[model samples]
Target: GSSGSSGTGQRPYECIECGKAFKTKSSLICHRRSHTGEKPSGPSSG
Candidate 1:
């Protein structure tokens, strides 16, 4: 089979959580962005 199964600089791990793509498999199991802020680049009514 001459199929390109491996891709350079690409992680095959596909994450459906909010349409996110994760590279590492371990990160998928224990997922949590430490730098996640309360507001995700959204405008707040000040």
Candidate 2:
């Protein structure tokens, strides 16, 4: 499990497909691409 004991009050994004959520805006931006079939730019692949 991850370790965290506080909240930052930043925006939280919900994934429309899998109902997953993230705590960072950049993460949410990247996640939205998954819904649109956009691949990662480097190293990682499906």
* Reference-based lDDT, each prediction: 0.57, 0.69
lDDT of 1: 0.57
Counting clashing residue pairs in each candidate, in order, gives: 0, 0
Q: Write the per-residue lDDT of candidate 1 for residues 1-46, one digit (tens) a residue.
A: 8977874434566555444557887875555443345845656475
What's model 1's TM-score?
A: 0.34
Residue 36 displacement (Å), model 1:
17
Candidate 2: Cα lDDT at 40: 48
Give, for candidate 1, the lowest lDDT window spanning 10 residues: 28-37
Could you say which candidate leads in TM-score?
A: 2
Clashes of 1: 0
Model 1: how large is the Cα RMSD against the reference? 9.9
Each model's TM-score?
0.34, 0.44
Against the true structure, whose lDDT is highest? 2
In model 2, the Cα lDDT at residue 27 comes to 90
Q: In model 1, which regions exceed 4 Å deviation? A: 1-10, 32-46
Judge candidate 2 against the unseen true structure and give its global Cα lDDT, from 0 to 1.
0.69
